[PDB]
Design a protein around this ligand. Structure first.
Ligand SMILES: CCCCCCCCCCCCCCCCCC(=O)OC[C@H](COP(=O)([O-])OCC(O)COP(=O)([O-])OC[C@@H](COC(=O)CCCCCCCCCCCCCCCCC)OC(=O)CCCCCCCCCCCCCCCCC)OC(=O)CCCCCCCCCCCCCCCCC
Ligand SMILES: CCCCCCCCCCCCCCCCCC(=O)OC[C@H](COP(=O)([O-])OCC(O)COP(=O)([O-])OC[C@@H](COC(=O)CCCCCCCCCCCCCCCCC)OC(=O)CCCCCCCCCCCCCCCCC)OC(=O)CCCCCCCCCCCCCCCCC
Ligand SMILES: CCCCCCCCCCCCCCCCCC(=O)O[C@@H](COC(=O)CCCCCCCCCCCCCCC)COP(=O)(O)OCC[N+](C)(C)C
Ligand SMILES: CCCCCCCCCCCCCCCCCC(=O)O[C@@H](COC(=O)CCCCCCCCCCCCCCC)COP(=O)(O)OCC[N+](C)(C)C
Ligand SMILES: CCCCCCCCCCCCCCCCCC(=O)O[C@@H](COC(=O)CCCCCCCCCCCCCCC)COP(=O)(O)OCC[N+](C)(C)C
Ligand SMILES: CCCCCCCCCCCCCCCCCCCC(=O)O[C@H](COC(=O)CCCCCCCCCCCCCC)COP(=O)(O)OCCN
Ligand SMILES: CCCCCCCCCCCCCCCCCCCC(=O)O[C@H](COC(=O)CCCCCCCCCCCCCC)COP(=O)(O)OCCN
Ligand SMILES: CCCCCCCCCCCCCCCCCCCC(=O)O[C@H](COC(=O)CCCCCCCCCCCCCC)COP(=O)(O)OCCN
Ligand SMILES: CCCCCCCCCCCCCCCCCCCC(=O)O[C@H](COC(=O)CCCCCCCCCCCCCC)COP(=O)(O)OCCN
Ligand SMILES: CCCCCCCCCCCCCCCCCCCC(=O)O[C@H](COC(=O)CCCCCCCCCCCCCC)COP(=O)(O)OCCN
Lengths: 111, 155, 127, 438, 536, 51
């Protein structure tokens, strides 16, 4: 009912007309499951069940926006500390409103 | 300090002369300069020849600094391994020198956003000394520790 | 016999799968398990999180009572009936440098205040 | 340099004249010749020339090509990884598309003109639309995603290049120019934001990788993501440093958020290819942040980590492709008992997964150490944030390995002689870089 | 000569795990023990040269392992007194475990791979101990972490073993992350990674906390002890190596090598871990679990002693080396009992005719754990308890832990030998070869030598304590042992249940931390990338 | 810089200034200035008028 497709000697031929099934690469394929396949389809196509609800908005804002805000605040604090540590004047950052034009320290200058 | 356009074009012509003199004789170490091209430009980018030459000088210097730091570390490690338990007293100087080399190498070209590398806690100790002096003279109470004699093996 | 023991095979899935089925770990042997035991399903010993919290509430005070006395109620002078080990001046000065040292609690010393401030050092590097 | 460029132009040329039956053999020989020419370029690159090792111009600013530290590493990586892609692909159409994509990418890395850079990198736009959208195994959605994201980002980059060419009068990197404009910086930045996947512009990558052939996925992860770092080092930091320093809190927020959200998203993945794709997105964040610090430690660390990723991600994508060929499945749930059934595939898979987790004997460890040191040079909190969240990568990798490692399986699905041959160079390169020959 | 030991272990790993098809099961039963014997000879030479004769040596293999700008580290090995002592103990225990595995793992399909993993595990432990810089220690730390992941999960078709390995890996990742942060702090402000230049008299609290958090992972302290109990899924030889030396000791070794710890934290954390581990071990009914909780308790004692005095580091290392022998013996004997009885539960053990050597080795190891006077465990434990008197809080908790330790240890000894037979009337047998007898001879030799040679220089130095205070540890141990023999009830069913659930640390993690982790992942993916930002 | 040792870009002195130089000798502007109507409509002073 089965036969060896591969030939090491190099005289490999596909017996497409053989009654016996060739032991080709397809022999080792794993049998799929109707329910697992539908689970895979549902998981990938999860945008269909998306709904804008107050709980969804709350969860999104609290975790994604909340993390982004925390990260920005920490980065701003670290920049302020570094500027104080280095002795540089308050740098003109993008959203910071500073009446100073300092951005890149001069390599020649001694701070 | 202001730079007039006449002076800027004069420096540009001098830079071109320097390039022409360099071009006259072949040099395999052209991009490893031993001396910078001195200038008073507001921005080094204005004179491209000065910018590239000085950048190559800075790279050469930094490579030298890194190798010097490695040498200092080797003498500190040998000194530490020879003395034994007397290492703290006898290896204070070598350690001081090694830490100074580390600061010079890191601080020279730290970058626009990088902080100064406080090898040996010298800056922190200095800050604490100033804070103590101010608190004591003004009669304030300092919430910070007083400056330390030694904070590290050397500095 | 360690090798070759019989095992029961987990039945093949035969109903629509829940969306969060990735929380279940099944290798094909019959007793599958949650990703983290105790996240759902049977709890070991039939003890809920509330029971564990009530236990910890009963236990915590008794465990913390020895530590709170010496650390907070007691003071350097009264903690022990002796002073810290006495060292020659050259040795003592070097030993006092260590923040995690044991010579910083010598009240008898005239440098006690400085040593105490050294022990309660900086939370983070200033530079 | 001239030899490398000539071999690059000969590889697409050779296909036109081959017998149509010798195509695969000729393509493999050409790929090896291009690798050897890259080695020659490395030999003819003296460290004494600190700025640019070699610059060649063929009559115009557009035809100015040159190699620097970043360019040299990326070009060697592309030449090293291309033979593997070639052997994995069958058919004249597939070979033609792959060879054209490779030629365009390899010419982009060495280009020193922004407009020429754009011309060469974006030439391989339809070819990716056609490759990712192939008849049976491709997805039109993924092709549309990647194509539209690339077009919009590259068009913004093009507008910035046009302004720089109008204002300064030249757009060649070799001419020192500085700009403080924020619109132009944003235009150049948006390309980097999209190409190197950074949240929220990372959606194109996973779709493309999943529905691309193994040769395509290997090329994409191996070198296509790196093209961002060449643009940053060569076309962004020299001119728009002021804007990177001005926006550093925002850059850090976006990079760390990308690292965190990508790590969390990797946890919900059930497809091996999607897991590898999201791991790449997480890994790109450290490289981007490290380069943005504009420090020696950061630029070197970013390039080194890029090489480590360009050696570890192709390996995982290759093993995943081999497994899919053996089993026709990428679902972790269907794949069980792989330890017992494929001891040789499993050993290499475990080794590569250990590499992806930045263990000490792997290039990722050294690279990560350098990148973390650069972040610590900026701020201690910056380093701490990245170091702490690295555990999430461990959780997903451990869960995947555990699901694959054991269970009951009735199929012997192990690698053939061809599959071991394809990964052996990658294994040896990983080991060599791991021991410190970076 | 110093390199040879690491070479022998890595060779045995490569040979068994890459060339096992040629060597065979018997070939691994030869090459493993032979290599470990040669490594023992080298470790003994190293110990004599460095510890006894005060000759530290540095071997730099190669320079510029990492060379990016200023950052430069080299692969170098410094054999200092701590390194020599740990090398010797590790190699002695590994040689014994390799001898043990010849008979224990005969019934396991991959005996070649097991031996390979054991030898690579020992090699990475020797790399961690002997490293001269922080990067080499990290290389060892990660190598032992990976080898533990590959050894705990050896039985892949058991979901418990794979989960136990994932647990170990995740906990160790969190710890090594804190360590990496501390190493970055130390490199930045001291200029080097070498321990000689690493010395800092005053360190900011952050570095101390990061160091402690890194150490509490491998040395399973409170909040980080969840993985140790679970690590029982692995084969018995793995448990002996991890618990006795390779894993638990690394945290203590790190704390002792770089004295950046804070007295207040280490004392409280240690005493808490000692008490909790003893209480958890009281409830436990699996033989292998009780010995794990005992390991946790002893680790608590070692961590606690660092706070008491300056010699605490020496006392901790002395306890660590004394503990590795007896604890290894306890695990190997437990494994043999399980193998002979086909049972893991204390209820079903009982008196049965056996080998004199195994029963004696179990009794002597239990006595060392208990604190029987004039034994290696006794001196190393009294050195801790006597010196902890100054810290009133630490001392009281440690004495209570001594009581609980004695109670469970005596209960286990009574249940395994004195108690009548509890297993079924079925044919069970495990015959012991001469290799197992050699293994127990080695463990007993270590135990005997420890008494003659000692564990710390300051072991017998006088602690100026009243006689009643100096001899109290003995009375508490005796009282606990007597109460344990009587198998009396000490706590109500509510507390016995609480202690059986190990304090509910894992129930907290599953109900709250894991749910939060997967809700963050749900928001990050389902709600956002594949929801809001995905086209219809 | 195109090197891995020093930071890319450059630094410009804040103290040193360059005196402005006219783009050309004579400047002819073909761009008309805003009309009075544009300014009137843009005036937001009185909200009702602006609206
Ligand atoms: C002097 C001594 C002699 C020494 C020699 C030196 C001479 C130097 C050069 C001479 C070499 C001959 C030139 C080849 C001409 C024909 C080539 C061709 O038809 O391609 C497919 C053809 C394969 O033919 P086929 O398999 O028999 O079937 C095709 C059928 O006709 C139809 O099949 P189909 O209907 O099924 O179509 C399916 C299609 C799938 O559908 C698509 O994908 C369509 C996509 C649209 C175009 C692709 C956009 C992206 C292309 C990027 C360019 C690739 C290079 C990247 C480098 C960046 C450059 C900026 O897939 C393909 O066709 C192949 C995919 C990839 C090939 C695309 C590249 C060709 C670009 C234009 C070709 C030139 C035609 C000029 C016409 C002249 C008179 C009519 O040739 C190849 O082997 C692969 C392409 C080789 C590219 C080299 C050509 C140069 C183009 C680069 C532009 C640079 C400027 C030009 C300067 C060149 C040097 C001066
Ligand atoms: C952060 C806080 C939490 C985040 C969100 C929390 C609440 C969000 C509230 C907003 C919302 O509900 O959006 C839903 C709504 C979509 O409606 P739907 O209920 O989902 O279904 C309708 C479709 O049929 C749906 O049919 P469909 O399924 O076929 O279409 C789905 C489509 C639908 O998607 C869209 O249409 C918009 C996608 C991006 C929205 C851009 C920002 C929106 C929220 C940002 C700030 C939220 C704070 C509150 O998604 C996509 O495939 C496109 C996304 C692919 C590109 C990825 C680029 C991402 C950019 C920003 C990501 C959003 C930030 C979160 C991640 C943070 C990373 C920084 O999206 C919008 O309407 C956009 C709102 C704002 C747009 C920006 C301003 C537009 C500028 C127009 C100026 C007017 C010019 C005047 C001249 C006009 C003549 C030319
Ligand atoms: C399918 C696989 C089957 C076959 C398995 C192969 C077995 C491989 C054997 C493992 C190799 C272990 C050796 C590790 C050392 C690496 C050797 C090496 O790198 O050569 C060094 C020379 O150094 C040595 O030879 C080391 C001695 C090796 C053996 C000594 C003891 C062996 C015990 C192993 C412990 C090594 C710990 C090192 C941890 C980093 C090159 O000298 P340099 O000129 O200084 O090179 C520059 C440095 N850098 C690489 C960073 C650019
Ligand atoms: C540092 C200086 C010298 C370095 C030597 C390191 C020691 C040997 C390293 C050899 C290569 C390193 C990684 C080997 C590939 C990783 C795969 C592996 O180790 O094991 C494979 C298979 O193993 C092999 O075939 C190759 C192993 C040969 C030697 C391995 C020694 C232990 C690995 C060392 C850990 C690497 C360190 C990386 C981080 C520091 C999978 O095993 P399991 O998942 O447990 O399943 C096996 C089936 N069963 C369920 C029955 C258990
Ligand atoms: C408070 C935290 C203080 C210290 C934090 C250290 C550890 C925190 C949580 C430990 C989780 C690690 C345990 C683990 O990986 O093992 C799980 C694997 O679980 C998972 O992979 C789920 C993911 C959990 C990992 C992370 C969840 C907790 C995250 C902490 C905070 C959440 C977000 C905070 C910042 C991101 C297997 O479960 P068991 O059934 O218990 O296996 C034991 C074997 N036996 C069957 C015999 C019982
Ligand atoms: C609709 C979208 C959004 C809606 C929902 C958003 C809700 C989020 C709101 C709170 C989020 C976290 C709080 C951070 C911002 C707090 C207030 C910002 C103002 C601020 O900068 O204060 C600083 C906050 O402390 C800090 O510097 C940061 C402390 C908190 C960071 C750590 C907390 C979590 C850690 C997790 C890792 C995240 C960071 C990783 C690096 C300290 O004031 P100042 O001294 O700086 O003076 C600076 C002058 N105001
Ligand atoms: C010696 C050093 C100390 C070692 C460990 C000390 C731990 C002490 C902390 C516990 C003591 C205070 C507990 C808070 C008071 C709660 C009192 C009742 C608890 C309650 O009603 O709800 C519980 C909340 O969980 C909780 O109570 C979780 C709160 C715990 C705070 C986090 C501290 C880490 C805890 C790690 C070990 C503790 C294990 C047991 C807590 C169960 O909630 P539910 O699941 O039934 O809700 C239903 C799901 N919708
Ligand atoms: C006997 C036969 C042996 C069989 C196997 C052994 C194979 C080779 C073993 C040793 C050879 C090591 C060379 C590999 C790469 C090292 C490159 C390197 O470190 O030099 C850099 C050259 O610049 C460059 O730009 C070099 C670019 C080319 C490097 C390769 C790029 C990746 C290609 C694919 C990875 C495979 C690598 C193998 C500059 O180094 P530095 O200036 O940073 O200072 C050095 C301290 N870090
Ligand atoms: C002064 C102006 C004022 C502002 C006015 C703005 C007005 C609109 C501006 C929007 C311009 C963005 C262009 C992209 C449009 C979204 C893509 C079209 C949606 C779509 O259905 O495309 C399908 C697949 O596309 C896909 O699969 C692509 C998925 C979504 C692409 C993501 C867009 C790239 C990133 C967006 C911004 C990135 C940086 C921004 C600087 C193909 O549909 P079909 O072929 O079947 O046709 C059948 C007809 N339904
Ligand atoms: C809300 C968070 C911001 C999201 C971006 C996060 C990280 C991006 C950083 C990229 C790094 C370099 C880019 C330079 C600036 C881009 C964004 C910086 C933040 C920003 O918007 O600052 C604005 C100025 O920037 C500008 O005026 C230009 C803004 C960008 C233009 C948008 C599209 C341009 C596309 C043009 C294509 C090519 C054009 C070439 C001619 C206003 O800040 P402010 O200084 O006024 O402070 C007043 C507040 N009180």
């Amino acid at each position: 009912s089965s036969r060896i497709a591969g030939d090491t000697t190099g005289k490999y031929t596909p017996n497409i007309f053989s009654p016996e099934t060739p032991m080709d690469r397809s022999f080792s394929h794993v049998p799929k499951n109707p329910f697992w396949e539908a689970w895979v389809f549902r998981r990938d196509n999860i945008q269909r069940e998306f709904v804008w609800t107050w709980q969804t908005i709350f969860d999104l804002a609290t975790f994604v926006g909340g993390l982004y805000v925390a990260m920005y605040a920490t980065a701003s604090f670290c920049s302020r500390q570094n500027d104080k540590r280095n002795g540089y004047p308050e740098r003109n950052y993008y959203f910071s409103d500073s009446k100073s034009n300092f951005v890149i320290p001069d390599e020649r200058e001694f701070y | 300090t202001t730079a007039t356009i006449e002076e800027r074009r004069a420096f540009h012509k001098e830079v071109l002369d320097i390039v022409q003199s360099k071009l006259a004789n072949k040099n395999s170490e052209w991009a490893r300069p031993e001396e910078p091209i001195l200038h008073n430009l507001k921005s080094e980018k204005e004179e491209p020849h000065v910018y590239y030459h000085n950048n190559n000088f800075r790279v050469t210097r930094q490579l030298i600094h890194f190798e010097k730091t490695k040498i200092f570390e080797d003498e500190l490690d040998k000194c530490m391994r020879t003395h034994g338990e007397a290492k703290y007293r006898k290896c204070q100087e070598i350690a001081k020198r090694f830490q100074a080399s580390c600061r010079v190498a890191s601080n020279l070209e730290r970058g626009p956003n990088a902080r100064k590398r406080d090898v040996g806690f010298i800056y922190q100790n200095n800050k604490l000394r100033e804070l103590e002096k101010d608190a004591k003279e003004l009669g304030l109470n300092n919430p910070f520790p007083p400056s330390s004699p030694r904070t590290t093996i050397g500095y | 016999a360690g090798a070759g023991g019989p095992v029961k095979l987990s039945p093949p899935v035969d109903k629509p799968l829940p969306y969060n089925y990735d929380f279940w770990m099944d290798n094909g042997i019959y007793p599958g398990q949650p990703i983290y035991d105790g996240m759902f399903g049977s709890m070991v010993g039939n003890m809920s999180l509330e029971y564990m919290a009530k236990g910890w509430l009963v236990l915590l005070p008794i465990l913390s009572a020895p530590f709170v006395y010496e650390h907070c109620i007691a003071d350097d002078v009264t903690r022990n009936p002796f002073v810290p080990r006495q060292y020659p001046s050259e040795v003592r000065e070097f030993l006092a440098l260590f923040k995690n040292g044991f010579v910083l609690n010598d009240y008898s010393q005239p440098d006690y205040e400085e040593m105490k401030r050294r022990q309660s050092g900086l939370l983070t590097p200033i530079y | 340099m001239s030899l490398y460029l000539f071999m690059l132009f000969l590889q697409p040329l050779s296909l036109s004249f081959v017998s149509r039956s010798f195509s695969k053999i000729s393509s493999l020989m050409m790929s090896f010749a291009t690798l050897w020419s890259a080695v020659y370029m490395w030999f003819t690159s003296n460290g004494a020339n600190q700025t640019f090792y070699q610059v060649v111009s063929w009559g115009s600013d557009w035809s100015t090509f040159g190699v620097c530290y970043t360019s040299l590493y990326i070009s060697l990586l592309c030449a090293f990884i291309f033979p593997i892609c070639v052997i994995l692909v069958q058919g004249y159409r597939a070979l033609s598309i792959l060879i054209c994509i490779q030629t365009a990418v390899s010419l982009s890395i060495v280009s020193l003109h922004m407009l020429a850079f754009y011309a060469l990198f974006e030439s391989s736009l339809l070819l990716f639309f056609i490759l990712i959208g192939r008849r049976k195994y491709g997805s039109l959605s993924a092709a549309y995603n990647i194509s539209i994201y690339t077009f919009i980002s590259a068009l913004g980059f093009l507008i910035s290049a046009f302004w720089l060419n109008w204002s300064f009068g030249s757009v060649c990197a070799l001419l020192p120019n500085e700009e403080a404009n924020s619109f132009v910086a944003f235009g150049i930045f948006i390309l980097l934001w999209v190409k190197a996947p950074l949240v929220p512009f990372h959606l194109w990558l996973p779709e493309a990788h999943v529905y691309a052939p193994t040769a395509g996925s290997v090329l994409l992860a191996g070198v296509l993501l790196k093209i961002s770092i060449v643009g940053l080092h060569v076309f962004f930091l020299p001119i728009c440093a002021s804007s990177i320093v001005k926006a550093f809190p925002l850059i850090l927020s976006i990079c760390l958020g990308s690292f965190i959200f990508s790590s969390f998203s990797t946890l919900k993945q059930i497809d091996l290819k999607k897991i590898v794709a999201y791991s790449s997105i997480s890994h790109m964040a450290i490289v981007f942040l490290s380069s943005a610090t504009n420090s020696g430690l950061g630029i070197q660390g970013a390039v080194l980590y890029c090489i480590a990723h360009g050696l570890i991600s192709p390996g995982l994508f290759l093993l995943v492709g081999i497994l899919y060929k053996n089993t026709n499945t990428k679902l972790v749930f269907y794949l069980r008992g792989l330890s017992q059934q494929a001891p040789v595939w499993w050993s290499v898979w475990v080794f590569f997964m250990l590499g992806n987790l930045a263990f000490p004997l792997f290039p990722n460890f050294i690279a990560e150490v350098v990148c973390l040191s650069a972040l610590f040079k900026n701020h201690e909190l910056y380093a701490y944030a990245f170091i702490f969240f690295s555990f999430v990568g461990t959780v997903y990798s451990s869960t995947v390995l555990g699901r694959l490692k054991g269970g009951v399986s009735s199929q012997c699905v192990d690698a053939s002689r061809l599959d071991v041959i394809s990964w052996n160079p990658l294994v040896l390169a990983t080991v060599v870089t791991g021991i410190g020959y970076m | 000569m110093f390199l040879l030991a690491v070479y022998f272990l890595f060779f045995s790993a490569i040979a068994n795990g890459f060339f096992g098809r040629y060597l065979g099961v018997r070939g691994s039963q030869l090459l493993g023990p032979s290599a470990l014997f040669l490594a023992l000879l080298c470790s003994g030479t190293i110990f004599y040269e460095v510890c006894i004769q005060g000759c530290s040596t540095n071997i730099k293999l190669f320079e510029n392992f990492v060379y990016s700008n200023e950052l430069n580290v080299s692969a170098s090995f410094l054999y200092d007194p701590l390194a020599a002592t740990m090398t010797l103990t590790v190699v002695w225990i590994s040689c014994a475990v390799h001898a043990y595995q010849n008979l224990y793992m005969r019934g396991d399909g991959s005996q070649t791979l097991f031996t390979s993993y054991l030898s690579a595990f020992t090699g990475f432990m020797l790399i961690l101990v002997a490293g001269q810089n922080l990067v080499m220690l990290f290389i060892g730390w990660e190598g032992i972490g990976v080898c533990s992941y590959l050894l705990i999960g050896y039985y892949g078709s058991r979901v418990s073993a794979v989960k136990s390995a994932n647990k170990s890996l995740i906990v160790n990742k969190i710890s090594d992350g804190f360590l990496l942060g501390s190493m970055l702090y130390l490199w930045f402000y001291t200029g080097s990674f070498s321990y000689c230049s690493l010395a800092t008299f005053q360190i900011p609290d952050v570095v101390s906390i990061l160091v402690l958090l890194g150490a509490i992972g491998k040395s399973s302290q409170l909040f980080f002890h969840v993985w140790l109990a679970d690590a029982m899924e692995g084969p018995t030889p793995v448990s002996a190596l991890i618990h006795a030396a390779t894993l638990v000791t690394a945290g203590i070794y790190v704390l002792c090598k770089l004295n950046l710890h804070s007295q207040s934290a280490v004392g409280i954390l240690g005493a808490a871990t000692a008490l909790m581990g003893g209480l958890f071990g009281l409830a436990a009914n699996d033989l292998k679990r009780v010995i794990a909780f005992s390991t946790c308790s002893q680790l608590g004692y070692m961590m606690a002693v660092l706070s008491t005095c300056d010699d605490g580091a020496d006392f901790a290392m002395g306890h660590l080396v004394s503990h590795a022998g007896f604890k290894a013996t306890l695990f190997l004997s437990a494994g043999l009992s399980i193998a002979k009885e086909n049972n893991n539960f204390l209820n079903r053990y009982g008196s049965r005719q056996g080998s004199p050597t195994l029963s004696f080795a179990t009794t002597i190891a239990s006595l060392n754990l208990l604190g029987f006077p004039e034994l290696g465990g006794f001196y190393s434990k009294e050195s801790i308890l006597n010196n902890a008197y100054i810290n009133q809080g630490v001392s009281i908790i440690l004495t209570l832990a001594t009581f609980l330790t004695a109670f469970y240890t005596s209960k286990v000894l009574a249940q395994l030998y004195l108690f009548p037979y509890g297993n079924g009337r079925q044919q069970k047998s495990f015959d012991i070869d001469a290799t197992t007898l050699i293994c127990f001879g080695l463990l007993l030799s270590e135990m005997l030598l420890r008494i003659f040679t000692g564990s710390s220089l300051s072991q017998n130095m006088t602690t100026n304590l009243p006689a009643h205070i100096k001899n109290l540890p003995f009375w508490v141990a005796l009282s606990g042992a007597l109460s344990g023999l009587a198998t009396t009830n000490l706590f109500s069913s509510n507390f016995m249940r609480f202690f059986g659930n190990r304090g509910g640390f894992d129930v907290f993690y599953a109900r709250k931390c894991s749910n939060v982790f997967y809700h963050n992942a749900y928001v990050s993916y389902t709600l956002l990338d594949r929801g809001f930002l995905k086209l219809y | 810089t195109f090197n891995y040792v020093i930071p890319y870009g450059g630094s410009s002195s804040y103290t040193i200034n360059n005196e402005p130089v006219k783009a050309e000798e004579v400047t002819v502007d073909f761009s008309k200035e805003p009309s009075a109507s544009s300014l009137k409509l843009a005036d937001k002073s009185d909200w009702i008028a602006y609206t």
